Subunit: 116 residues, 4 copies
């Protein structure tokens, strides 16, 4: 998997399960074209989002539906969602892990970029 | 100031100076209408973005131009920018501080919401 | 104030009120000598911890009683406390802000170091 | 492995390699008895720290030698080290992942606690 998304819940100290994750790729005209989508499993990651071949050079956006996640736990959170926007694979293929750590009024995101 | 944005640099342990901050408000048709803009001063905050009166109930987006900030320090960062999207002032006026802590491959954002 | 401590609650989006903060200074024999102590007010900061004069060059430890803070809100947290250990004022006086952002199973701390 | 430590570098967007990790367990008299130690590999984790059997109920301290890590990269960091202190396994065995995200003037730590 060259693109992995890992979501953690800082209130419960657990992976965040059943979080919607959307990936878009910026198109020729600058609109966000849907690229992939998934829901996090028990490990806090969605199932294989893409392959090395399909994951071409470009600008990507990962959106994580944090608001729905909290609401479903009976918590009213601050953010509508969390997004990460980055350029990928512009000096050859890399593997990307986007980690998001969630609290109701805060979140952190970090990228771990390795060689394949 | 009912809307304050505070940007910190985790590499230098300093406020992030000269960072562009944009605020948008979601319009009737769901497009992001420009609402305010500023550049952080030496304290890492832009100059008074709005007033209590203009800061009406609605969905707001704060974008922080993190990529340009790092590039100008000769660092090549991961994110294109950082954004915070939230609903504001829907149960009366509140004061909002959006804090962003920046590193080249990571950032955290938190909201402090108080009464006026 | 050359040493400020700012504690935020990421679950409530508020300053963390009534948090115990302890400061120690490493002594000649390497034991931690009590240096200052306070409880955060409504702004999430303890009252003036020290003066520029008393805040001499040395190794300092700031402990924040996060466990008691959460327990008192009826939450059972992961950490026993949070600590920050750093050398201060070894190239002349600096002003130090230690910011701590708290969730029940996570916390972040950052230092902002400025000239007086 | 019931106790895992994962260290990430937010400046480089990589696992933090060759970081010293120490684990202590609080003893009958309240002194910190050495429990385990390791250095992070290329994945940012030390090699198997303990077993389910040896990892008994008690208060543990994990120290991460962040200062040496940064210094060795020619960076002068703020913190002397990072520590996490917590009670473990007091309602039966759990698996603990302590994640630390490092920048020169900041760090975050989070715990992921699962059932075996
Ligand atoms: C609620 As959404 C991040 O799928 O537009
Ligand atoms: C580079 As921008 C966040 O002003 O579109
Ligand atoms: C509970 As304490 C950080 O005052 O030893
Ligand atoms: C430098 As150390 C955290 O091993 O005392
Ligand atoms: Zn969605
Ligand atoms: Zn968005
Ligand atoms: Zn801009
Ligand atoms: Zn964006
Ligand atoms: Zn105390
Ligand atoms: Zn401690
Ligand atoms: Zn050591
Ligand atoms: Zn320590």
């Amino acid at each position: 998997c060259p693109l992995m998304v890992k979501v953690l819940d800082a209130v419960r100290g657990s992976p965040a399960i059943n979080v919607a994750v959307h990936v878009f790729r910026k198109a020729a005209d600058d609109t966000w074209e849907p690229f992939a989508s998934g829901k996090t499993s028990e490990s806090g990651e969605p199932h294989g989002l893409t392959t090395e071949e399909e994951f071409v050079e470009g600008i990507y956006k990962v959106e994580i539906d944090t608001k729905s996640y909290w609401k479903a736990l009976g918590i009213s959170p601050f953010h509508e969602h969390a997004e990460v926007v980055f350029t990928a694979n512009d000096s050859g293929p890399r593997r990307y892990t986007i980690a998001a750590l969630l609290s109701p009024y805060s979140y952190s995101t970090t990228a771990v970029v390795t060689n394949p």
